[PDB]
Amino acid sequence: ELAILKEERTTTPYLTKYERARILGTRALQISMNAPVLVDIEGETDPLQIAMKELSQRKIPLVIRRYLPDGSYEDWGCDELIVD
Amino acid sequence: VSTSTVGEENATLLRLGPEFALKQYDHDGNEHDLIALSLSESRLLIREALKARSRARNGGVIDDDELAKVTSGAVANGVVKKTLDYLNTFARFKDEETCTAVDQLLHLHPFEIAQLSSLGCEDVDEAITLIPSLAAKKEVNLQRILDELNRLEDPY
Amino acid sequence: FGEMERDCMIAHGAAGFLKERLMEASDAFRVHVCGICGLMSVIANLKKNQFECRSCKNKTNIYQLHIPYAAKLLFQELMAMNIAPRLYTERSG
Amino acid sequence: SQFPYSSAPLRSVKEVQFGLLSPEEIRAISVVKIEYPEIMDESRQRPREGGLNDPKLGSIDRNFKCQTCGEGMAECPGHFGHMELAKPVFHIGFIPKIKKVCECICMNCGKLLLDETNPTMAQAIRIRDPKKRFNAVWQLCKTKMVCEADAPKVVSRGGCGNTQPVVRKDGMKLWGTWKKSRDAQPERKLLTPGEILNVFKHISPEDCFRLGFNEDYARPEWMIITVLPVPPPQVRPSIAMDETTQGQDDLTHKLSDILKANINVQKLEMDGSPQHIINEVEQLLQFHVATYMDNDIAGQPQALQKSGRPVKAIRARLKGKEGRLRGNLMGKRVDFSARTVISGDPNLELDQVGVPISIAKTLSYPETVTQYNIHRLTEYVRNGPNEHPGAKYVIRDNGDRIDLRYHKRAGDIVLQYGWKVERHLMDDDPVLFNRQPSLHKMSMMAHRVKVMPYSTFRLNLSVTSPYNADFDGDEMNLHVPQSEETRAELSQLCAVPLQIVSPQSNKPVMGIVQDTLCGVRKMTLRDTFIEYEQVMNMLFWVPSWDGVVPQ
Amino acid sequence: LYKEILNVIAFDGSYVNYRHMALLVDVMTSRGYLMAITRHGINRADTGALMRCSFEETVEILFEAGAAAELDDCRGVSENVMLGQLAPMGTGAFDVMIDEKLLTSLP
Amino acid sequence: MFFLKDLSLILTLHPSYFGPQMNQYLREKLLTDVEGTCTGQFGYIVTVLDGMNIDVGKGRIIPGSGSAEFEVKYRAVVWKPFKGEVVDAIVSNVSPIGFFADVGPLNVFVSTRLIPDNLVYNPSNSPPAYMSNDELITKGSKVRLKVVGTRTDVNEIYAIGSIKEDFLGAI
Amino acid sequence: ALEDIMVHYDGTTRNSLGDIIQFLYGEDGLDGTQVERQTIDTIPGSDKAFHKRYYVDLMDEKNSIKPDVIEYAADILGDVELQKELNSEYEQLVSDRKFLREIVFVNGDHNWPLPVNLRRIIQNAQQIFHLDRAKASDLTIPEIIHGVRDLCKKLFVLRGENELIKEAQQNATSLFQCLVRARLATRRILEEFRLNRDAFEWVLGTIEAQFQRSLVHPGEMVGVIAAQSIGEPATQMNVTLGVPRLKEILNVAKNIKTPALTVYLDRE
RNA sequence: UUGGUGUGUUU
Ligand SMILES: [Mg+2]
Ligand SMILES: [Zn+2]
Ligand SMILES: [Zn+2]
Ligand SMILES: [Zn+2]
């Protein structure tokens, strides 16, 4: 109906900072609610530093749904998008 | 809680409410005729679905009281066991061979097609009474339908 | 936390902070809607757990929301002036 | 957790369906018909059912639960009532649009004085915008003077041939002037609202669709009120005058005045009536319904109170700077703020703000009890609420509040994984920081927490330029996040190191101020020499110095 | 229009990026005529109803909201604030899913 | 009356469930929550088709709460009765006020005023039954009734029958 | 007035309805903070200066590369196979000079706010790679030409492959590619700056990455930042100027107080 | 733990 295949993807393949902000907030909220961490834990035990330790390595199980302004949307995985 | 695709009920007048219109829609938006099921059809689907679910849980390796235990929760065990025994004692065409024969014989509203198969009848007089919707349709063979249906009906 | 504070929050854009400010550290308030006539007329008994849109005989098409209590105040004031805000929870066209 | 559980699932609003209200749907939504002007029974303790304070509307007393929803006052939204007016009235807010509508159509059959025959009208029909559609029909019909009996062999469209009157507006009272015939007596007469109701009930849905309305939402016999609703008393709750007597809200006074004029209407048609005693009591009814929604109408004196003050209408509760929207919804007052007078402190970083201890005691932050923060949070319990660094509450997994000033036994409390604890304002948290008024997108900036005695706010002095603060007594606020989500929102966008460069003028707007600047210019003039000994300290002050002096 | 704004700002030595003035002078000629900044500009747009009501004249424009059966899908900002919603910008211009793709890659 | 119905269920998942078996948990959760339950809108949901292959979709993270919202679409066999619908049944009990007949999931009450006059309740008989001369309605008797009224408790539905009409009665 | 304007994931500028206002954000796609005022060197000066600085000549010996700076200098002089490359590139820059002279920046004031500033990267590589020496280099002219030409098709602002995408791509970064070829032409690099190969490859990769990192971000609520950042000098500010002139320009009057003409006369 | 008016002072 709306959705586009993952090959016509003409939006920018970067994370930008607003996207980055929401990913950090939501991943940190999950790991605050006892979602176990994929990366090592040295001294970074506060959840925001845990989230930046993940995004440093690009280890994030989320999906951006950019609503393109028709209404359709490009399901970008985190794994493919280039971390700034 | 649980919702459907669609976003005074009188079975005699074929008024089935907003949920059971003639044209339904599947989870892709495609148009589809309403799927009304005779007692015999329903017996095949429910029994097939229950044993297929049990096989999938066993990685790929009969009785209704055992087949109803596949469900989860005592409420579901109850409704399914009560439904199988009802279908076990009123489904005329208890195998898919006869069932497809009845399927081709009948294939006319989908509600009537399921009633004619579920309710055994002797004559046309008994069919247009219990199913008063067949009145103004004007296309019988009904009798040989009922005769073939009754002949296809296995003994018990 | 006035207007122009909200303006600079929009300029930064992190509106999730704004949904903290004007929902959660304030008059967080919970209402119900009948999904057919779209209104908040649905009478709420909870320990008996029953509902009735009495202009519709609707007993199933029922949702709750999370709106500011002053927004609800707007709605009751308006319906007491005969304008009908109806809140349908799906895009229609 | 802050709400009691319900089974209807949470969804956000998507579409506002604005529309009008039928008289019907008002009659079908309520629970009670409204009758009696007195509030009390006979001053007898639970006032009169049938008066204005029906407990079936929702009780405005803490200790008597509601008698319709069966909840407390904390949860009951209220329920609408409605007062059956005997005489139908105008809504006060539609009188120009109702004016235009009775400028449009026939007054006998109620039909539009144009069809698709006249082709400019037939072109105006094709418009997808309702508003300028009704403008174009309003334009082309104001010249059309006669209801065509014929189609504009008799093709009788529906009209009788009687002319169409000229619609004046005079406040609440309309004056239609037919050209009752050429020239003969013009009967400029008051358009009684019930006559127009009987007109409006005779409209085809096509004339609804052409004239800028919609049938299931805005049917223009609904712009005349037969039944004016009653809001529940949360919207007019009684105020403790001096803690025994309740002065009422002015809505209660006005609905009492409406119900008094209602009964003095129904008193006249049940006895000998001298025909303008009828007219004045009806016009007084219309007056009371007018001031229920608006006490600002031009030309007429205001509705007045028992002090000499004007009445708080519904219109006065919505317009103005301090109405419900600009004063309560678009912007409002909130909590977890703080406020003081500031002081400079150059012995600081750029993202640090001094926190007086008592403000750290009062405010808090809910840190989630996780599996990596149990020990300190238990210690913050063991400081309790009179000792920084510490805690004030444990919210359980359900919604249980334990105020630790009112609890003897902190020592026997284990905590569970996933409970909630609000500890105090400890170091290194985001705060928002902010000075009224905001003027550019740096005027709110995030920071970090440094805890100091001697109760003022500390700053760096390089941040003095963006907030535009001096130290002759400014107030700067301090909002606090109450979630993890907003913490990361602030820490990645509204932090000072990410807002250095202002797109106002694509330059840094945070620089050097008074002393550091004029001092460094006095320092690195050419003829300035320093001995080694003082230089030891001076290079010790740099946090980023490696450990190597220059040559 | 652009020459006017760049003049009367940069008379007192003050400096402005092009793209901000550009966005202002192009919104002022969105619709083929000068959509000036008053109530007459924005409220005579067919945009979101409460967004237009939040600026001026909220009584009349609410009466024209309910008076003509408008459908406001609430994509304006002021709606989604006063309906207490995830507003559509910043972090909320876009939803976030869970991912069966990467959680299949996970053990 | 049996149908195939395309239904869906909104499931909200707490972040502590964000683990490697998330989709399988949701599929089991759908079955536990939907199978055997009754609603006046669809009827009894008897069994869900193809339960182990249900596509649960992706969970949308709810802003501000961290929890994920799944819309689990599925197709089930549902049974809803109708006023006017003739059905067969098996009588479960007989009492002075009529008899009760099991029509699949639910139970139907036929009162004495909706039983033909020649059928007389005989308690002395063993086993107790409504009897005539060539008619016999005891427990376990196949009967054909007509649903003349459906009442809804949203938990269990209640239907009242009748054999006071043509071609209805014992079979 | 602006409070909803959001730059979406197609580089456009819509309101709540979708009234698109600018097809490309700020006519460039570049974030508003991320500029400096630089010098597009090929605007000013005479034809003598341009033909002396840039015009390569591979037939005449002396107007070529003075051979101290390059290793391969035996392998060069006379080859028309490389001369036609350089004539095409000199005509390229005459096209750019006519372009930036006569279309865009007509009065020739060359200082303009333009993104990522390359000169700083060049001298950063210089101080990294110890770039004195006054030494032969092994970096050839065809590698320079193909580096510039393979740069000018890697500055994707508007990504995708439809015809208006490629057209809007070349409409987008014409001035920025004009900047790069205004600086990194062959005689300027291999005389005035003296790079090596490895410095030049690092220059290419870094101009890639930072003109990627100064694209505007999507969802920058540019109307709101815009409105505040125009209101802010309005705080601290014979023709009317200042606040009433700003008020009249916003609230658009049919009667402003003292209108004016700018009337040129003809050249004779 | 009142409302509602009104006055003076802070940035
Ligand atoms: Mg000052
Ligand atoms: Zn309803
Ligand atoms: Zn109540
Ligand atoms: Zn007429």
Residue D274's CB is within 10 A of a number of other CB atoms, namely 8
Q: What is the CATH number of the domain that holds F13?
A: 3.30.1490.120
E-assigned strand segments in D71-172: 81-90, 166-170
Closest CA to C26 of C44, C10, C6: C6
CB F98 within 8 A of CB F120: no
Three-state DSSP state, D437: coil
Contact D229, D80 (CB under 8 A): yes
User: For D18, left (φ over 0), alpha (ψ -120 to 50), or beta?
Assistant: beta
Domain containing residue B76: 37-156
Dist CA D234 CA D74 (whole Å): 11
Residue F97 shares a structural domain with residue F77:
no
Show me where chain A is broken: residue before each gap, C-N > 2.5 A.
none
Instruction: Give the torsion sign (CA, D98, D100, D106, D112).
Output: negative
The secondary structure element, H or E, covering residue D247 is strand D246-247
Choose among G149, G153, G177: nearest CA to G166: G153
The rounded distance, in Å, linking the Cα atoms of C83 and F76 is 43
HEC sequence for E35-101: CCCCHHHHCCCCCCHHHHHCCCCHHHHHHHHHCCCCEECCCCHHHHHHCCCCCCCCCCCEEEECCHH
Answer yes or no: do F65 and F109 share one domain.
Answer: no
CA–CA distance, E69 with E63 (Å, rounded to integer): 10
The whole-angstrom separation of Cα C54 and Cα C40 is 11
Q: Which helix H or strand E contains G99, and what residues bound it?
A: helix G80-99
Q: Does C91 reside within a domain?
A: no
**How far is C-alpha D363 from the geometric centre of its chain's CA atoms?**
27
Neighbours of chain C (3+ CB pairs under 8 A): A, D, E, F, G
Measured CA B19 to C1' H9 distance, in angstroms: 70
Are both F72 and F145 inside the same structural domain?
Answer: no
Residue D299 contacts residue D171 (beta carbons within 8 Å)? yes
The total of other beta-carbon atoms located within 10 Å of residue D409's CB is 7
Specify whether the CB–CB gap between B92 and B154 falls below 8 A. Answer: yes
- Distance of alpha carbon C56 from its chain centroid, rounded? 20
DSSP state, residue G73:
G
DSSP-based three-state secondary structure for D78: coil
Tell which of F82, F97, F131 closes a domain: F82
D436 CA – H8 C1', rounded, Å:
22
Helix %, strand %, coil % for chain D, to 5? 25, 15, 60
Which residues are D258's β-sheet partners? none
CA–CA gap between residue D449 and residue D431 (Å, rounded): 7
Q: Are residues F140 and F59 in the same domain?
A: no
For residue B104, the number of C-alpha atoms closer than 13 Å in the C-beta half-sphere is 6
Terminal Cα distance for chain E, rounded: 61
Residue D472, annotated as binding a ligand: yes
- Please check whether residues B4 and B43 belong to one and the same domain: no
Say which residue the tokens 């009752």 belong to.
D180
> Can you tell me the distance from the alpha carbon of A23 to that of A58, in angstroms, rounded to the nearest whole number?
11
C46–chain G Cβ distance below 8 A for any pair: no
CB A4 within 8 A of CB G9: no
B1 and B47 together in one domain? no
Amino acid residing at B37: L
List the resolution, Å.
9.9
Measuring CA to CA, which residue among D222, D172, D46, D203 is closest to residue D109? D203
Q: How many C-beta neighbours within 10 Å does residue F84 have?
A: 17
User: Is the C-beta atom of D240 closer than 7 angstroms to strand H?
Assistant: yes
Same domain, F61 and F118: no
Same domain, F88 and F170: yes
Final residue of a structural domain among F52, F82, F112: F82
Q: Confirm or reject contact between E90 and chain A (CB < 8 A).
A: yes
* Cα–Cα nearest to E78, from A38, D167, D381, G3: G3
Q: Is residue G93 left, alpha or beta, with left meaning phi > 0 and alpha meaning psi from -120 to 50? A: alpha
Q: Rounded CA gap, C38 and C75, in Å?
A: 12
End-to-end CA distance of chain C: 35
Count how many domains chain F has.
2
- Judge whether residue D437 contacts strand H, using its CB and a 7 Å cut-off: no
**In this complex, do F16 and D9 lie within 8 Å of one another by their Cβ atoms?**
no
Calpha distance A1→B29 (Å, rounded): 9
Report the distance separating Cα B2 and Cα F75, nearest Å: 12
How far is Cα of residue F72 from the mean position of the Cα atoms in its chain? 22
> Alpha-carbon distance G8 to G14, whole Å?
8
The torsion angles phi and psi of G6, rounded to 5 degrees, stand at -130, 125
Integer angstrom CA distances of residue B100 from B150, D35, D362? 15, 69, 77
Provide the positions of strand H that have an atom within 7 A of a protein CB: 2-5, 10-11
In whole angstroms, H2 C1' to D76 CA is 22
Distance F78 CA to ligand 2 centre (A): 27
Contact C71, D329 (CB under 8 A): yes
Q: Do F73 and F34 have their domain in common?
A: yes
Which residues have a Cβ under 8 Å from the Cβ of F76 and sit 6 or more positions away? F4, F5, F7, F34, F45, F46, F47, F48, F49
Nearest by Cα to F108 from F98, F96, F118, F117 = F98
Q: Which domains does chain A have, with CATH numbers?
A: 1-84 (3.90.940.10)
CA gap D175, G157 in Å, rounded: 66
Q: Which residues precede chain breaks (C–N over 2.5 Å) in chain G?
A: 237
What does residue D457 show for φ and ψ, rounded to 5 degrees? -90, 130
Tokens, residue D525 = 């003039």
Which helix (H) or strand (E) segment holds residue D17: the answer is: strand D15-17
Residue D352 amino acid letter: Q
Residue B102: other Cβ atoms inside 10 A: 22
Considering CB atoms only, which of E91, E92, E99 is closest to F58? E99
Domain enclosing residue F170, as ranges: 83-171
Does any strand H atom come closer than 7 Å to the Cβ of D239? yes
Per DSSP, the three-state class of D367 is: strand
Token digits of residue D258: 């409406």
* CB-based contacts of G67, cutoff 8 Å, min separation 6: G73
Cα–Cα dist A63/A60, whole Å: 9
| Domains of chain B: total | 2
Experimental method: cryo-EM
Nearest to B118 by CA among B3, B11, B1: B11
C34 domain residue, yes or no: yes
> Which neighbouring-strand residues pair with D340?
D476
Provide the residue range defining the domain that includes C47.
Answer: 1-81
Same structural domain for residues B30 and B41?
no
* The pairing of beta strand B36-37 with beta strand F2-13: antiparallel
The answer to whether D394 and D364 have CB atoms below 8 angstroms apart is no
Distance (Å, whole) CA D481 – CA D477:
13
Distance CA B49, CA F78 (A): 13
| Strand H–CB D328 distance below 7 A | no
CA distance E90 to G218: 8
Among D178, D181, D185, D180, which Cα is nearest to D164's? D178
Report the length, in residues, of chain D: 551
Domain end, chosen from F43, F65, F82, is at F82
- Residue C90 counted as domain residue: no
Distance of alpha carbon G15 from alpha carbon E51, whole angstroms: 12
Look-up: residue for tokens 């049996």? Answer: F2
The 8-class DSSP code of residue D147 comes to -
Task: Collect all residues from A whose CB is shorter than 8 A from any CB in D.
Answer: 17-18, 20-22, 24-26, 28-29, 32-34, 41, 45, 47-48, 51
Domain E48-92: top CATH class:
mainly alpha
Q: Which of D493, D418, D1 is nearest to F64 (CA)?
A: D1
Provide the residue type at C40 as one letter: M
Residues B92 and B146 in one domain: yes
Tell me the three-class secondary structure of chain F, residue by residue: CEEEEEEEEEEEECHHHCCCCHHHHHHHHHHHHHCCCEECCCEEEEEECCHHHCCCCCCEECCCCCCEEEEEEEEEEEECCCCCCEEEEEEEEEECCEEEEEECCEEEEEEHHHCCCCCEEECCCCCCEEECCCCEEECCCEEEEEEEEEEECCCCEEEEEECCCCCCEEC
Helix axes B96-106, B142-152, angle to 10 degrees: 180
Q: What is the dihedral of CA F7, F13, F19, F25, to 10 degrees?
A: -40
The three-state (H, E, C) secondary structure of D278-343, written as one string: HHHHHHHHHHHHHHHHCCCCCCCCCCECCCCCECCCCCCCCCCCCCCCCCCCCCCCCCCCCEEEEE
Subunits adjacent to chain F (3 or more Cβ pairs under 8 Å): A, B, C, D, E
The verdict on B17 and B74 lying in the same domain is no
**Are F111 and F121 members of one domain?**
yes
Residues ending a continuous segment of chain F before a break (C–N > 2.5 Å) = none
Q: CA triplet D327, D333, D337: central angle to 5 degrees?
A: 155
Report yes or no: B40 at the F interface, CB cutoff 8 Å.
Answer: no
What would the two tokens of residue D262 be? 């209602």
| Cis bond upstream, residue D9 (ω within 30) | no
Q: Cα separations (Å) of B22 from B135, D459, F154?
A: 19, 72, 25
Q: Rounded to whole angstroms, how far apart are CA atoms F108 and B39? A: 18
